[PDB]
Amino acid sequence: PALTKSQTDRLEVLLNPKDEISLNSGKPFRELESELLSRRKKDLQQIYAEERENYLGKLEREITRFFVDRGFLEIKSPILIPLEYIERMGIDNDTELSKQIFRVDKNFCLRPMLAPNLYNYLRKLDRALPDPIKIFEIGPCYRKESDGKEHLEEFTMLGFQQMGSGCTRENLESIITDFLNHLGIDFKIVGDGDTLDVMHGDLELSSAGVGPIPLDREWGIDKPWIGAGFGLERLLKVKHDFKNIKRAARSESYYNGISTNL
Amino acid sequence: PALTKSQTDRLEVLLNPKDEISLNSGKPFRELESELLSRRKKDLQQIYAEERENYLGKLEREITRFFVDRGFLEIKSPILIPLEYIERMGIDNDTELSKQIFRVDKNFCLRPMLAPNLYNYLRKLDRALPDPIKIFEIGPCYRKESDGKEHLEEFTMLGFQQMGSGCTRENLESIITDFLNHLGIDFKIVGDGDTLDVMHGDLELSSAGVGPIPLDREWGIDKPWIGAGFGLERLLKVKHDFKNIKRAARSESYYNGISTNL
Ligand SMILES: Nc1ncnc2c1ncn2[C@@H]1O[C@H](COP(=O)(O)OP(=O)(O)NP(=O)(O)O)[C@@H](O)[C@H]1O
Ligand SMILES: Nc1ncnc2c1ncn2[C@@H]1O[C@H](COP(=O)(O)OP(=O)(O)NP(=O)(O)O)[C@@H](O)[C@H]1O
Ligand SMILES: N[C@H](Cc1cccc(Br)c1)C(=O)O
Ligand SMILES: N[C@H](Cc1cccc(Br)c1)C(=O)O
Ligand SMILES: [Mg+2]
Ligand SMILES: [Mg+2]
Ligand SMILES: [Mg+2]
Ligand SMILES: [Mg+2]
Numbered sequence: 095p096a097l098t099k100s101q102t103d104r105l106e107v108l109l110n111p112k113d114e115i116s117l118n119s120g121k122p123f124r125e126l127e128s129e130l131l132s133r134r135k136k137d138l139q140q141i142y143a144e145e146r147e148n149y150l151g152k153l154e155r156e157i158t159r160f161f162v163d164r165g166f167l168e169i170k171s172p173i174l175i176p177l178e179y180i181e182r183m184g185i186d187n188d189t190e191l192s193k194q195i196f197r198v199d200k201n202f203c204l205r206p207m208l209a210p211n212l213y214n215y216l217r218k219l220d221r222a223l224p225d226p227i228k229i230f231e232i233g234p235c236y237r238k239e240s241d242g243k244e245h246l247e248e249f250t251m252l253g254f255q256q257m258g259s260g261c262t263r264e265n266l267e268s269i270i271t272d273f274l275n276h277l278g279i280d281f282k283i284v285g286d287g288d289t290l291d292v293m294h295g296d297l298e299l300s301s302a303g304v305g306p307i308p309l310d311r312e313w314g315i316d317k318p319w320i321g322a323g324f325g326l327e328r329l330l331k332v333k334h335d336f337k338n339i340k341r342a343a344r345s346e347s348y349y350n351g352i353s354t355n356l
Numbered sequence: 357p358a359l360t361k362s363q364t365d366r367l368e369v370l371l372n373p374k375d376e377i378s379l380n381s382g383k384p385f386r387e388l389e390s391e392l393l394s395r396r397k398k399d400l401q402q403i404y405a406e407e408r409e410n411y412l413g414k415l416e417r418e419i420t421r422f423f424v425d426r427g428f429l430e431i432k433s434p435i436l437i438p439l440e441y442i443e444r445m446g447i448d449n450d451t452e453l454s455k456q457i458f459r460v461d462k463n464f465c466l467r468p469m470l471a472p473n474l475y476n477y478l479r480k481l482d483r484a485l486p487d488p489i490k491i492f493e494i495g496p497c498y499r500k501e502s503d504g505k506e507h508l509e510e511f512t513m514l515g516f517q518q519m520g521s522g523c524t525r526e527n528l529e530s531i532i533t534d535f536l537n538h539l540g541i542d543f544k545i546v547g548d549g550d551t552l553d554v555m556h557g558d559l560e561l562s563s564a565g566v567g568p569i570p571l572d573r574e575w576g577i578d579k580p581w582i583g584a585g586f587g588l589e590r591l592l593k594v595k596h597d598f599k600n601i602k603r604a605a606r607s608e609s610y611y612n613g614i615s616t617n618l
Contacts, residue, residue, distance in 0.1 A: 135484040141429070142485050147420075148430040155417060158409075167403070168410040172606050173435075173496055174458075174466075174510050196436075198458055198466070204436075214608050218616040222397040223404050234435055234496065248436050344434050346476050354480040 097123050107353045108134055111335040137352050149334075149342065149350045150250060153326050154232045157252055160276055161230045164269070166254055167219070169231040171211035177203045179210035182312055194237040196247075204236035208253035208323060213313035216257045220317070226258035232326070234344075243338040244297055246327055250344075255321030263288055263304050266320040270302065279332050292322070294332050300324040359385050369615045370396055373597040399614050411596075411604065411612045412512060415588050416494045419514055422538055423492045426531070428516055429481070431493040433473035439465045441472035444574055456499040458509075466498035470515035470585060475575035478519045482579070488520035494588070496606075505600040506559055508589055512606075517583030525550055525566050528582040532564065541594050554584070556594050562586040 097105070101123040108130035109115065117126065162168055177195075180203060185191045196204040205211070208231050219227050232252045239245040254269070267283055270292055274281045282293050287307035292300035302322035310316065330342035334351055341351040348354060359367070363385040370392035371377065379388065424430055439457075442465060447453045458466040467473070470493050481489050494514045501507040516531070529545055532554055536543045544555050549569035554562035564584035572578065592604035596613055603613040610616060 138481070138484040139486070146424045146427070146429050148432045150432045151420065151430050155420075158413065158417075162408045165408070167408050168413050169611075170410045170412045170606050171608055172510055174498070196460055198460060204460070211608060215616070218608075218618070219400070219611075221618045222400040224401070236436070248434055344432050346433055346473060346480075349431075349481075354477070356480070356483045 095122075097126075105130060106337075107355065110134070110137070110351065111337070131356055134352050135356055138349065138356075141350060141352075149330055150326060150344065153330060154250070156277070157232060157273075157326070160273060161254060164228075166228040166230045166256075167223075169212070169215055169229050170233065171208075171215065171231060173205055173234050173236075174198060174202050175205045175210060177201050180206075183207075183210055184309055184312075191237070194239065196236045196238065204234075206235055206237045208233075208235065208251055210313075212253055212255045212321070213310075213315060216255060216319070217314040220257070226256050226260050228254075228256045230254035243340075244328070244331075246339055246343050248344055250326040252324040252326060253321065255319055257305075257315070257317050257319040261304065261318040261320045263290075263320070266290075266302055266304060266322070269320075270300065270322060274299075277329065277333065279329055292324075294328075297328060297332065299328055299332070357384075359388075367392060368599075369617065372396070372399070372613065373599070393618055396614050397618055400611065400618075403612060403614075411592055412588060412606065415592060416512070418539070419494060419535075419588070422535060423516060426490075428490040428492045428518075429485075431474070431477055431491050432495065433470075433477065433493060435467055435496050435498075436460060436464050437467045437472060439463050442468075445469075445472055446571055446574075453499070456501065458498045458500065466496075468497055468499045470495075470497065470513055472575075474515055474517045474583070475572075475577060478517060478581070479576040482519070488518050488522050490516075490518045492516035505602075506590070506593075508601055508605050510606055512588040514586040514588060515583065517581055519567075519577070519579050519581040523566065523580040523582045525552075525582070528552075528564055528566060528584070531582075532562065532584060536561075539591065539595065541591055554586075556590075559590060559594065561590055561594070 097117065102117055105117050105126055158168060180195060191206060195206060198204060212229060212231060215229055216227055230253060233250065235249055235251045237247060239247055270283065280294060281299060284291050284293055288304040290302050291298055292302065300322045305319035327339050327342040331339045336342055336351055341348050359379065364379055367379050367388055420430060442457060453468060457468060460466060474491060474493060477491055478489055492515060495512065497511055497513045499509060501509055532545065542556060543561060546553050546555055550566040552564050553560055554564065562584045567581035589601050589604040593601045598604055598613055603610050
């Protein structure tokens with residue numbers, strides 16, 4: 095008998111991208127399931143015996159070293175942010191993002207992006223640090239999303255920003271290119287303040303920008319800048335050839351892309 | 357003229373624990389403020405020129421290396437968790453913690469602790485990994501709190517748990533002792549399933565436990581265990597002799613304990 099769709103769904107959960115197994119063959123569900131269960135248990139045993147590091151944590155640490163080594167200051171700013179920061183960012187009711195905010199209490203929200211906190215740090219650090227000011231942050235961000243293989247409601251974003259001298263599109267593309275070649279992730283930069291997107295096929299890895307833009311004034315910024323935001327789970331999805339970004343997420347259902355339901 | 361209380365408050369923001377400056381002296385506010393501003397700008401310049409790492413990020417990475425090296429698997433689990441996990445943990449209306457939860461939407465909350473996710477990982481990994489199972493997680497936790505120099509509403513917690521063989525109070529105290537001696541943090545273990553607290557004077561650094569306890573059954577756990585939870589900002593507060601834990605927090609107001617309002 096052919097596998098049911100439910101049985102195929104179950105096998106897909108246990109299938110990893112490097113497997114050379116095809117579900118289409120005549121072998122019965124129970125034997126395919128037992129084979130994949132054995133493989134995934136061995137995969138977890140090998141992680142536990144050797145490296146023991148979580149993909150998302152390890153990627154954050156690798157990205158951190160890259161940017162610290164390039165002269166960027168590591169920022170850790172609040173995840174629970176004032177709701178007023180959303181409106182200040184120009185996110186009004188005519189934008190998609192206005193409907194995607196997780197509100198907390200009556201005056202706070204889970205941050206959907208890093209830009210407000212990075213703007214505040216640029217303004218404050220400009221009183222103390224020499225030109226140019228280079229900063230970055232990695233951490234959780236939150237958006238309400240429709241179901242989709244490329245979106246999480248709880249994800250992790252890298253944001254970096256440079257302000258002052260050297261804030262050219264060329265320098266921005268050079269940072270992006272060195273960064274993704276360091277990680278081993280294929281990309282194309284697409285673009286015509288200037289804006290550009292970093293694409294892996296149809297998947298957006300990053301949106302980047304060149305300042306100054308009119309919004310800067312509301313944040314007390316009056317210098318040129320360049321910066322970009324990257325989703326870490328999307329980087330992991332591409333690097334490991336996951337079919338669904340849920341394999342890369344903070345999760346109780348997957349560990350380093352391996353099903354925990356064994 | 358003596359300094360006003362408001363002027364003293366302003367100087368205290370700029371005062372760092374290693375400063376050898378006393379505000380009590382006759383010198384005028386403006387000169388004391390200008391001296392402290394110069395010192396704090398130089399402190400930020402030195403960080404930017406040399407290490408560029410954030411105290412909270414760096415501590416997370418150091419703790420991660422300690423536990424990975426000791427055989428613990430690094431977990432990254434959801435911060436936004438089902439509200440049902442709170443009740444399942446035995447947190448009912450007769451507990452303080454029930455009134456401290458940040459609710460999100462109608463069925464989710466910001467996690468106030470790591471225990472639910474660690475229980476779930478122990479249960480699932482017991483199907484794949486050899487005895488004993490050793491896991492840990494570091495990440496944001498959230499609690500509504502009264503104003504106080506030892507509490508944050510947004511903080512970072514280390515949780516570790518071992519399940520199976522070797523789950524003795526002696527082994528638990530040995531992990532705690534090696535860990536805090538590695539970090540260079542003075543402590544006392546106080547205690548009479550068994551429970552114990554790790555104290556720095558009157559400040560609680562950790563609460564730890566030895567299983568099994570009746571609650572385990574609700575989470576599908578039926579093996580002995582040991583574990584503990586530590587607040588990272590409290591570790592930083594003790595290590596750096598901060599007077600208020602706000603100096604150690606995810607923050608827009610302090611960077612590595614240095615005021616950003618210069
Ligand atoms: N829901 C999400 N899940 C995972 N990653 C995300 C999510 N939203 C944004 N990101 C990442 O964060 C980066 C910067 O955010 P932003 O440019 O605002 O996203 P976006 O324009 O909404 N992308 P998309 O929703 O795919 O059209 C993106 O390039 C993504 O890599
Ligand atoms: N609001 C907070 N801010 C910073 N750290 C915290 C906070 N709550 C708990 N922690 C840390 O997390 C550890 C384990 O949490 P738990 O034992 O539930 O805290 P607790 O018993 O409420 N401590 P306390 O509130 O100081 O009496 C504690 O030992 C603290 O180091
Ligand atoms: N907030 C993030 C990060 C960021 C930071 C600075 C400049 C730029 Br462009 C983007 C984003 O959504 O892209
Ligand atoms: N949830 C955390 C971490 C934790 C994990 C396992 C056992 C123990 Br005890 C404590 C706490 O509040 O202590
Ligand atoms: Mg989007
Ligand atoms: Mg975009
Ligand atoms: Mg408490
Ligand atoms: Mg306690």
